Amino acid sequence: MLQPKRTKFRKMHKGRNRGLAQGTDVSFGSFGLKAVGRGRLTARQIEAARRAMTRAVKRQGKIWIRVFPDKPITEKPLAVRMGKGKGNVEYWVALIQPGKVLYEMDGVPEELAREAFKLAAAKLPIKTTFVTKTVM
Amino acid sequence: AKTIKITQTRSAIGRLPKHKATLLGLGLRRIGHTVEREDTPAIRGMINAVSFMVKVEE
Amino acid sequence: MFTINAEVRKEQGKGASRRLRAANKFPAIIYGGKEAPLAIELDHDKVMNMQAKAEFYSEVLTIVVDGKEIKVKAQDVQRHPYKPKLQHIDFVRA
Amino acid sequence: GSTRNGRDSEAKRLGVKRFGGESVLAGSIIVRQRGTKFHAGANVGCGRDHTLFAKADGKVKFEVKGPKNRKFISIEAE
RNA sequence: UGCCUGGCGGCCGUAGCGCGGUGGUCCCACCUGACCCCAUGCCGAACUCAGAAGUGAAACGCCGUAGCGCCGAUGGUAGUGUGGGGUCUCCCCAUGCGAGAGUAGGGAACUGCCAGGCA
RNA sequence: AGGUACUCCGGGGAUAACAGGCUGAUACCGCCCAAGAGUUCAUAUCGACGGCGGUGUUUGGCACCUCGAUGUCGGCUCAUC
RNA sequence: UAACGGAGGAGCACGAAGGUUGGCUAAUCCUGGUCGGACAUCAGGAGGUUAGUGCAAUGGCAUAAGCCAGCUUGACUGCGAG
RNA sequence: CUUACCAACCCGAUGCAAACUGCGAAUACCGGAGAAUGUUAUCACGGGAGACACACGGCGGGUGCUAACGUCCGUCGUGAAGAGGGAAACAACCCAGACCGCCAGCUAAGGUCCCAAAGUCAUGGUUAAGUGGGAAACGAUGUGGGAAGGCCCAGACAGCGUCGAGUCGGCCUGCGCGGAAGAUGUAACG
Ligand SMILES: [K+]
Ligand SMILES: [K+]
Ligand SMILES: [K+]
Ligand SMILES: [K+]
Ligand SMILES: [K+]
Ligand SMILES: [K+]
Ligand SMILES: [K+]
Ligand SMILES: [K+]
Ligand SMILES: [K+]
Ligand SMILES: [K+]
Ligand SMILES: [K+]
Ligand SMILES: [K+]
Ligand SMILES: [K+]
Ligand SMILES: [Mg+2]
Ligand SMILES: [Mg+2]
Ligand SMILES: [Mg+2]
Ligand SMILES: [Mg+2]
Ligand SMILES: [Mg+2]
Ligand SMILES: [Mg+2]
Ligand SMILES: [Mg+2]
Ligand SMILES: [Mg+2]
Ligand SMILES: [Mg+2]
Ligand SMILES: [Mg+2]
Ligand SMILES: [Mg+2]
Ligand SMILES: [Mg+2]
Ligand SMILES: [Mg+2]
Ligand SMILES: [Mg+2]
Ligand SMILES: [Mg+2]
Ligand SMILES: [Mg+2]
Ligand SMILES: [Mg+2]
Ligand SMILES: [Mg+2]
Ligand SMILES: [Mg+2]
Ligand SMILES: [Mg+2]
Ligand SMILES: [Mg+2]
Ligand SMILES: [Mg+2]
Ligand SMILES: [Mg+2]
Ligand SMILES: [Mg+2]
Ligand SMILES: [Mg+2]
Ligand SMILES: [Mg+2]
Ligand SMILES: [Mg+2]
Ligand SMILES: [Mg+2]
Ligand SMILES: [Mg+2]
Ligand SMILES: [Mg+2]
Ligand SMILES: [Mg+2]
Ligand SMILES: [Mg+2]
Ligand SMILES: [Mg+2]
Ligand SMILES: [Mg+2]
Ligand SMILES: [Mg+2]
Ligand SMILES: [Mg+2]
Ligand SMILES: [Mg+2]
């Protein structure tokens, strides 16, 4: 479960999630799993998809995770009223915009990369698509 | 010199204050009201600001 | 051997470019040398098939625009963020 | 529970009081600032809290000058 | 008039670094002495004074050179004022404004006043 | 400085407790992917890590209706979907 | 420019830590050096403010507002265009 | 010597920031000038107040669960204090601001088969689900369109060497299908 080792501040404004992604090319491997939709990826989701990916290729090749969950999310406990300060940090997310390459793979055939990425996408709350490296 | 005719085509109810002030500067008082104004860049700028609710007869 | 047919653009900017891509074309620019840059439109389907060949990005191409032939190299390409489409190409005069 | 926050200070109404081209009388404050984001040019003084004020009547003028590309405010006699 | 140098400015990296070369009649610098005017929380290192044997080594100036910094379009993209729309957490259309980054490319500053040397 | 369940007046649904409402975190019920368990065998039967919904049934959030009164838990009688 | 929104501070200090004149320039590291060590003082180099600011944070600061020294009381009284 | 090794620094490549900034808009705001328009719409002084419980909607946000017809700000609109027409019914949405009378006319939003005023209008397409007229991940030879590709009279694909004309599966895209259980009565087009 990824999570910043330390941060300047404990809590963060909700913010919004507009725009298209930066980092839309396969930059490290040969195959990538790219986001088509918009949303949040929790650290548990990122890790559940990593495990499914890694078991499918029998821990061969190499896998990059291009996203990191650096945004803390707070929640108010059950049976607590409104007010009395911001809630407690409960988990961490990465904000995803369309076009974001989420994972990359190398050192395996394309057919196996497609199958491994399919099993991973089934763990994620956002629609995705399989991409390959381009020369330009 | 040259003049143009401007007619108000939509209501002013609920428009932005700047838009109401522009209709005032053109002299337009109601839907269907037509005024005749000199053709200057200042007049053309006022028409441009409220072009969605006026029509020009060149 | 790669030949591309193009037209000179008669309208530029955000609105004109989005109307191009909604009509299955896309804009591009030819610059370099001492000639002024030339803004052109390409048919999206034809060029998207050609650029799938790796030699598109290494060879010297020919852009036929208004009858005249121009020798160029592909210099930069803007791709759609997640669809398999092209938004723009820079061509440098060769 | 309760919060350990909830404090703030009153707003200080800093910023530019007379913009470029404005005619001012001697003594008029041109900008209030913490430290010298703007520096005093011709016919302008710098107060103890780094307020820039006109030392003569005239028109406000902003300009970038010097080796550090610093911003200066001066008064053009009118 | 041209070349070279010193001083005071304009300008504030297209003007700054690096690398390579180059200049001593003059100017500049290092330099030579110091009982002194003056100076070192010790030191004539610095500041200061009295000088002119030596050297352009350092520094400085000048010339060269893209390894850098720096500057930088065109086109597209992002955003956005107004009006309209959708499947409305986000977008699209008409119109106006239009980046940042990156690309081609540019680029080894330019200039005013006075003074001195040389031709 | 305190107490009032011995209490009292003027007010408020401007404001809580019951029931309604909005909501659906929580709860409950479906589903998707399939690590595995199941001698072998993912899918007879279970389904880890994660994902998507439905209900309005729980615990709650809100304070919109009622404070010039909308009587409570359980039992009994009678039910209806 | 609000919330029982997110984070930190004050209820002083200083006759110099104030005035002025003259001067000065940081952190950190590397190398060599008696005791001496990861770290003391010395020398050179790299570096270029990554230091400093009586005390939070922000905006400033090289012409320094940072560091050192001499002399000092303008930490003056009455007023004050704007 | 060796590393299961860990590796800071620096170099190269990739992201993220309300309390990061070597960049940086649109708007907004301040000032000056000019025309046209506006019943001085501006400023000052004086007589009289009311008000200091706001609501919803749009946009930019904090909080909450990007829950609430929730809560707290900024800004615009309407309600409040505003009737008429539309959205079945529906303060706050859309159109539009009612001085009075008319058994005249043209339009707005929204509409034109009957209830119910006006096209059972014209032309070209799509859907077969009453979809239209409630919903997701995901599933599928539904069906329309488009650009490529593989194989094929040197006989493909299916069936069983035969057989003789197409065949295969990706991509993008329009409309539909399943996923889809609730309580008085059809009851999710009025
Ligand atoms: K240079
Ligand atoms: K009492
Ligand atoms: K008692
Ligand atoms: K729900
Ligand atoms: K619900
Ligand atoms: K279900
Ligand atoms: K009551
Ligand atoms: K029952
Ligand atoms: K002093
Ligand atoms: K002193
Ligand atoms: K509002
Ligand atoms: K009104
Ligand atoms: K139906
Ligand atoms: Mg924002
Ligand atoms: Mg636009
Ligand atoms: Mg403040
Ligand atoms: Mg000397
Ligand atoms: Mg030399
Ligand atoms: Mg630019
Ligand atoms: Mg040089
Ligand atoms: Mg008792
Ligand atoms: Mg009573
Ligand atoms: Mg209740
Ligand atoms: Mg309840
Ligand atoms: Mg109430
Ligand atoms: Mg309320
Ligand atoms: Mg009730
Ligand atoms: Mg009653
Ligand atoms: Mg009753
Ligand atoms: Mg206010
Ligand atoms: Mg307020
Ligand atoms: Mg000094
Ligand atoms: Mg001082
Ligand atoms: Mg103005
Ligand atoms: Mg009050
Ligand atoms: Mg109030
Ligand atoms: Mg309010
Ligand atoms: Mg809002
Ligand atoms: Mg809110
Ligand atoms: Mg409310
Ligand atoms: Mg709300
Ligand atoms: Mg009232
Ligand atoms: Mg009304
Ligand atoms: Mg009505
Ligand atoms: Mg009605
Ligand atoms: Mg009619
Ligand atoms: Mg009829
Ligand atoms: Mg239906
Ligand atoms: Mg469906
Ligand atoms: Mg029934």
Using CA atoms, how far apart are residues A125 and A90, in angstroms rounded to an integer? Answer: 19
Tokens 């913009």: give the residue: D19
Using C1' positions and the CA of D70, the closest nucleotide is E12
Beta bridge partners of A62: A106
Euclidean distance between CA atoms B3 and B37, whole angstroms: 5
**Least Cα separation, residue D35 to chain A (angstroms):** 27
3-class DSSP state of D57: coil
Question: In sequence order, what are the residues at sequence separation of 6 or more whose Cβ sits closer than 8 angstroms to the Cβ of residue B48?
Answer: none
User: Is some CB atom of chain A closer than 8 A to the CB atom of D69?
Assistant: no
Among left, alpha and beta (phi > 0; psi -120 to 50; other), residue C70 is beta
Q: Return the amino acid letter for A81.
A: R
- Angle (CA) A67-A73-A75 rounded to 5° is 155
Q: B13: how many CB neighbours lie within 10 A of its CB?
A: 6
The architecture in CATH of the region B1-58 reads: 2-Layer Sandwich (3.30)
Q: What is the DSSP string of B10-50?
A: S--TT--HHHHHHHHHHT--STT-EEEEE--HHHHHHHHHT
- At what angle are helices A110-121 and A43-56 packed, to 10 degrees? 150
Q: CA-nearest residue of chain D to A86?
A: D3
Q: Would you say A115 and A56 are in contact if contact means Cβ atoms under 8 Å apart?
A: yes
Indicate the DSSP class of residue A116. Answer: H
The residues spanned by each domain of chain A are 21-136
C33-CA/E66-C1' distance, Å: 20
Q: What are the residues whose beta carbons fall under 8 Å from the beta carbon of A119, sequence distance 6 or more?
A: A52, A53, A56
Q: How many CB atoms lie within 10 A of CB B10?
A: 12
How many whole angstroms separate alpha carbon A16 and alpha carbon A40?
11
Tell me A59's DSSP state.
T
User: Min CA distance, D7 vs chain A (Å)?
Assistant: 13
What are the helix (H) ranges across C1-94?
A: 14-22, 44-50
Whether A42 sits with its Cβ under 7 A from any strand F atom: the answer reads: yes
Q: Cα separation of C59 and C73, whole Å?
A: 7
Determined by: cryo-EM
Q: Which CATH architecture has domain A21-136?
A: Alpha-Beta Complex (3.90)
Select from A129, A134, A136 the Cβ nearest to the Cβ of C82. Answer: A129
User: Using only C-alpha atoms, what is the Rg of chain B?
Assistant: 10
Q: Per the CB < 8 Å rule, is C57 touching A136? A: yes
Token pair listed for B27: 């002299």
Q: How far is A84 from chain D (nearest CA, A)?
A: 5
Long-range contacts of C74-78 (CB under 8 A, 24+ apart): C74/A136, C76/A136, C77/A136, C77/C51
Closest residue, chain D, to A77 (C-alpha)? D1
Find how far residue D58's CA is from the centre of its chain. Answer: 16
What resolution, expressed in A, was reported for this entry?
1.5
Contacts for A2 with CB less than 8 Å, ≥ 6 apart? A43, A46, A47, A65, A68, A69, A92
- What is the Cα–Cα distance from A39 to A37, expressed in whole angstroms? 7
Cβ atoms of A64 and A33 closer than 8 Å: no
Q: Which domains does chain C have, with CATH numbers?
A: 1-94 (2.40.240.10)
3-class SS of residue C29: strand
Q: How, if at all, do strands C3-8 and C61-65 pair? A: parallel
- The whole-angstrom separation of Cα C65 and Cα A108 is 43
Mark yes or no for CB contact A21/C76 under 8 Å: no
Q: What is the C-alpha to C-alpha distance for residues C87 and C41, in angstroms, rounded to an integer?
A: 11
Q: Measure the CA–CA gap between B44 and C14, rounded to whole angstroms.
A: 25
